[PDB]
Amino acid sequence: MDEKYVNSIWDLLKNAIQEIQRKNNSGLSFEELYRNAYTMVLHKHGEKLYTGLREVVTEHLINKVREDVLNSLNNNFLQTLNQAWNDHQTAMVMIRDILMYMDRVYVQQNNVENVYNLGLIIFRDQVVRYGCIRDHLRQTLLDMIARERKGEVVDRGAIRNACQMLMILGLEGRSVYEEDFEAPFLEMSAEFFQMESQKFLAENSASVYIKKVEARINEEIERVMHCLDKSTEEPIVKVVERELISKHMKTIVEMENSGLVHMLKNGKTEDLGCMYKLF
Amino acid sequence: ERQINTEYAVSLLEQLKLFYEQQLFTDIVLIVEGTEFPCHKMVLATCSSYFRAMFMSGLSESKQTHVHLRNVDAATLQIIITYAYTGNLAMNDSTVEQLYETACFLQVEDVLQRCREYLIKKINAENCVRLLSFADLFSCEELKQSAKRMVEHKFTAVYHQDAFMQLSHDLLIDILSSDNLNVEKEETVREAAMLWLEYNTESRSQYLSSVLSQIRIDALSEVTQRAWFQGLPPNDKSVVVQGLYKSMPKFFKPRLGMTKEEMMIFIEASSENPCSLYSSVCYSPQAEKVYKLCSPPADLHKVGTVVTPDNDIYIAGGQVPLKNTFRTVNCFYWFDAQQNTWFPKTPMLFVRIKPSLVCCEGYIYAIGGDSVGGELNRRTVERYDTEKDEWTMVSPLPCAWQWSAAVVVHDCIYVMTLNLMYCYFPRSDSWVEMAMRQTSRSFASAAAFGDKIFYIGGLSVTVEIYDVNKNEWKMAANIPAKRYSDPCVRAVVISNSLCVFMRETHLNERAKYVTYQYDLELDRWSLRQHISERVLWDLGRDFRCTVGKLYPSCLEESPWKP
């Protein structure tokens, strides 16, 4: 029909979506919006609808969550981030339902990502990969994981929630999450384990150091399998071995004071067994 | 997966149907222009992808039991609901459009796919542009493409459809700018584009530029340019300027429909690879080349051919080996002139062996061919409807004949046997007795050239010419063939001139292919062209011949060493 009719339809649909984004879907009518999406995509105006959806979503994000995260960067930063992620997801549920009715025809014809993937991408671009939020999140996660490694206990379910959030934000696999979280955490763990091995090689001998490094590996793999994502272990354990064992192998078995020769001369069976099972 | 359906799923669905028809355990009712449809939310959630969001999203409509759904038909929603309680769609041929519209509105994927298949199978002759605009309205790649090609093929022969006038620009641009126009001339598309903007001259002068440019320089002649000029709305200056631009640029190239070379389609040839038995190839009279075709079933043989006046190829009947660790099938197929494939059609009702298909008055007539026989009568015939896509029983043959031939002359059916001939009147659906031949010959075929039937061969070189206006059989001459041989004669029309395609075979000698030019008043087969063995190899004995136009670019040459 005329442009005024479709403009009014799009205006009312945008108003209804804005309400859904403000958690006011209880007073919205599923029929009215589905029929309007039907009569909108029917007239071959899906491009305008998609562009308007993207614009409304990114505007709502930049106005609400970009301000909320930057306003509470020190008072429950990760908690507010997880809450905003959950709100975005629970709104994009219905948003994706309607615009998935739209997505069938649109993405099967125009060959583009779905609206759920569109929301995930725009969220990744406007919140997580922000110029300031990204570095702040990196620094705070490194600080809290270092404080956890120091010996004192902190919250652990929140880290699992954040890692699952980043994994879902990847939206294709382990491309972004393995880079935004692991890459930095890897350098920090490298420096930490290097300093730890350098401190252990001088303060102890080849007798009690092996049990300590075994306990360290056990607690590290347990934290990585319980507090982090599902695979999470190949590069972590590779770098941990390359830092600890590849450095202690040359000096701890030959120097002096009950290394490998002395612990074999006196006849220590458990020492040889644990050294064989570790190396 | 661990899940059954033997007397447990069917029982569950029957209990759900009983609860529905008795109006039991219903918690949601659909209001459709005053009509009430009490139903359940579980079935609507498992069937439609829209009702799941209608009942899941915490909203006012989810809570409302009296939901007022509009922009939907009552009968269509009722049939969708009953398909959601029985699985039986039972769709007709008239309400398919509104049913598909309501299915796309409600996002019911299974019935959507069902209606899509039903529509893609039923693009016969007329609803082509209509369902094409339908698939343009509701983006449907499958329908869109089949309908696109269907229009490229038939639209370029009528170019006078009422639904064609009511088309969106982008669709018209895609249709006209494509290189799949089955037109032997370039002015027909020009005048078609003209009348598309003649019913909307002045009003639609914006498209009168893009569509004009689409026809290209081949038909953007100074004459039509100046015509459109003197015809436009007054006080239009820049329009003439932009029209003058369209004459030299934009890649004038030849089209594809002009390559309608009258060629020679063949079936059941001597296959090259010993893993295959037979093959279907073609011969070019002018290009002097041998093209190949894809086998329609790829395992079934003993088929019959027919060519409509619109240059269409069909295949009916045939036998296929049972492949246990030759069974007869009544399947039907049609050859695509561009995709080099075979799309099946409505199969026959009787499994025929080598059926003789004849085209007349737009209908396909399959005369005899072992429809299946085991009685004193048996003589039967089944005709096909190219428009309604169905088989219609007609008056059966008067006498039972084997290894017979049938042609069409002057919009009438003529079947030839050993010595008798009957003319089937399509208007009255009856057989009238015709002249009898003085010679008893079988295993031969006849050709319908002009107003005379030329029954050639039989067991030989018997040339018995029959005329319809005269109703008499006469002899003309004997074809010049080498002695001590068994010629395989093939009579067919070519270039509006009666010719023959014969092959001679001797003892300890190779086969030779050569076509001769026969004259009516001379009674002699002048040497027209001798098919060289360097391009064509042996064919066999059970091969058939028919005349038809094909495309060289779509088909592929048959590789064979000279």
Question: At what angle are helices A30-42 and A46-71 packed, to 10 degrees?
Answer: 130
Spatial separation of the C-alpha atoms in residues A18 and A40, rounded to whole Å: 18
Find all residues with CB under 8 Å of B114, minimum gap 6, and list them: B89, B91
CATH number of residue B339's parent domain: 2.120.10.80
- β-pairing, B313-316 vs B332-335, is antiparallel
* Partner residue opposite A38 with nearest CB, options B57, B105, B139: B105
Chain A nearest C-alpha distance from B54 (Å): 6
> In angstroms, what CA-CA distances link B181 with B166, B255, B293?
20, 8, 21
Is the domain of B131 the same as that of B269? no
Residues in A whose CB is inside 8 Å of some CB of B read 25-32, 34-35, 38-39, 42, 44, 93-94, 97-98, 100-101, 104-106, 108-109
Chain A nearest C-alpha distance from B64 (Å): 10
DSSP H stretches of helix in A23-182? 30-42, 46-71, 77-109, 115-123, 133-150, 157-170, 177
* Number of Cβ pairs < 8 A linking chain A and chain B: 66
Selected residue of A24, A31, A108 to mutate for chain B interface (largest B Cβ count, 10 A)? A31
| Residue B153 belongs to a domain | no
Q: Which tokens hold the place of B513?
A: 């292919």
Is the domain of B132 the same as that of B265? no
3-state secondary structure of B431: strand
> In angstroms, what CA-CA distances link B204 with A33, B175, B189, B260?
34, 18, 19, 35
Would you say B263 and B536 are in contact if contact means Cβ atoms under 8 Å apart? no
Q: Which tokens hold the place of B530?
A: 């001798």
* Partner residue opposite B60 with nearest CB, options A27, A106, A108: A27
3-state secondary structure of B531: strand
Spatial separation of the C-alpha atoms in residues A227 and A185, rounded to whole Å: 14
Chain B residue numbers touching A31 (CB-CB < 8 A): 54, 61, 67-70
Is the domain of B265 the same as that of B126? no
* Partner residue opposite A97 with nearest CB, options B57, B71, B141: B57
Q: Which tokens hold the place of B11?
A: 């029982």
Chain B residue numbers touching A108 (CB-CB < 8 A): 139, 141
Yes or no, beta carbons of A28 and B59 under 8 Å apart = yes
Yes or no, beta carbons of B58 and A29 under 8 Å apart = no
Rg (CA), chain B: 30
- What backbone phi and psi angles, to 5 degrees, belong to A215? -65, -35
- β-pairing, B66-68 vs B28-32, is parallel
Chain B nearest C-alpha distance from A126 (Å): 27
Q: Which domain holds residue B450?
A: 261-557
- Sort residue B86 into left (φ over 0), alpha (ψ -120 to 50) or beta: alpha
> In angstroms, what CA-CA distances link B171 with A32, A102, A119, B143, B168?
30, 21, 32, 13, 6
Is the domain of B128 the same as that of B267? no
Cα-to-chain-centroid distance, residue A255? 44
Would you say B464 and B455 are in contact if contact means Cβ atoms under 8 Å apart? yes
Question: At what angle are helices A46-71 and A77-109 packed, to 10 degrees?
Answer: 170
Residue type, B169: H
Chain A nearest C-alpha distance from B131 (Å): 15
Q: Identify the domain boundary among B114, B137, B160.
A: B137
Q: Identify the domain boundary among B106, B137, B168.
A: B137
Number of domains in chain B: 2
- What backbone phi and psi angles, to 5 degrees, belong to B352? -100, 150
Residue type, A266: N
Taking CA–CA distances from B64, the nearest residue in chain A reads A29
Yes or no, beta carbons of A30 and B137 under 8 Å apart = no
Spatial separation of the C-alpha atoms in residues A106 and A46, rounded to whole Å: 7
The experimental method, as deposited, was cryo-EM
* Lateral strand order in the sheet of B390-393: B356-360, B363-367, B381-385, B390-393
* Lateral strand order in the sheet of B332-335: B304-307, B313-316, B332-335, B342-344
| Residue B317 belongs to a domain | yes
Spatial separation of the C-alpha atoms in residues A91 and B58, rounded to whole Å: 11
Taking CA–CA distances from A39, the nearest residue in chain B reads B105
Taking CA–CA distances from B68, the nearest residue in chain A reads A31
* Partner residue opposite B54 with nearest CB, options A30, A108, A109: A30
> In angstroms, what CA-CA distances link B49 with A114, B68, B111, B401?
16, 18, 12, 59
Q: Identify the domain boundary among B116, B137, B158.
A: B137
Chain A residue numbers touching B77 (CB-CB < 8 A): none
Q: State the DSSP string of B77-92.
A: HHHHHHHHHH------
Selected residue of B28, B32, B107, B167 to mutate for chain A interface (largest A Cβ count, 10 A)? B107
Residue B429: other Cβ atoms inside 10 A: 12
Q: Which tokens hold the place of B25?
A: 């355990």
* Partner residue opposite B71 with nearest CB, options A25, A35, A101: A35
Q: Which tokens hold the place of B261?
A: 């070379």
| Residue B1 belongs to a domain | no
CA angle, A220 then A222 then A223, to 5°: 65
Spatial separation of the C-alpha atoms in residues B314 and B336, rounded to whole Å: 10
> In angstroms, what CA-CA distances link A235 with A6, A186, A189, A221, A279?
54, 8, 11, 12, 18
| Residue B420 belongs to a domain | yes
| Residue B394 belongs to a domain | yes
At A224, which helix (H) or strand (E)?
A: helix A209-226
Strand-pairing partners, residue B493, are B498
Q: Is the Cα torsion angle A18, A22, A23, A24 positive or negative in sign?
A: negative
Cα torsion at A77, A83, A86, A91 (round to 10°)? -120
Spatial separation of the C-alpha atoms in residues B115 and B351, rounded to whole Å: 29
DSSP code, position B233 = P
> In angstroms, what CA-CA distances link B228 with A174, A262, B207?
62, 107, 13
Selected residue of B60, B76, B106 to mutate for chain A interface (largest A Cβ count, 10 A)? B60
| Residue B176 belongs to a domain | no
Strand-pairing partners, residue B474, are B465
Give chain A's length: 279
Q: Which tokens hold the place of A11?
A: 């205006």
Would you say B227 and B244 are in contact if contact means Cβ atoms under 8 Å apart? no
Would you say B189 and B215 are in contact if contact means Cβ atoms under 8 Å apart? yes
CATH number of residue B30's parent domain: 3.30.710.10
At B45, which helix (H) or strand (E)?
A: helix B41-47
Q: State the DSSP string of B105-143.
A: HHT-HHHHHHHHHHHHH---SSTHHHHHHHHHHTT-HHH
Spatial separation of the C-alpha atoms in residues B425 and B431, rounded to whole Å: 6
Strand-pairing partners, residue B385, are B363, B390
Q: Which tokens hold the place of A133?
A: 């939020």
Would you say A228 and A163 are in contact if contact means Cβ atoms under 8 Å apart? yes
| Residue B234 belongs to a domain | no
Q: Which tokens hold the place of A241?
A: 């071995």
Yes or no, beta carbons of A34 and B71 under 8 Å apart = no
Rg (CA), chain A: 27
Would you say B383 and B366 are in contact if contact means Cβ atoms under 8 Å apart? yes
Spatial separation of the C-alpha atoms in residues B302 and B268, rounded to whole Å: 8
- What backbone phi and psi angles, to 5 degrees, belong to B363? -115, 145
Would you say A172 and A121 are in contact if contact means Cβ atoms under 8 Å apart? no
- β-pairing, B327-328 vs B319-320, is antiparallel
| Residue B34 belongs to a domain | yes
Cα torsion at B533, B536, B541, B544 (round to 10°)? -140
Q: Which long-range contacts (CB under 8 A, 24 or more apart) does B481-488 make?
A: B482/B506, B487/B457, B487/B460, B487/B461, B488/B457, B488/B541
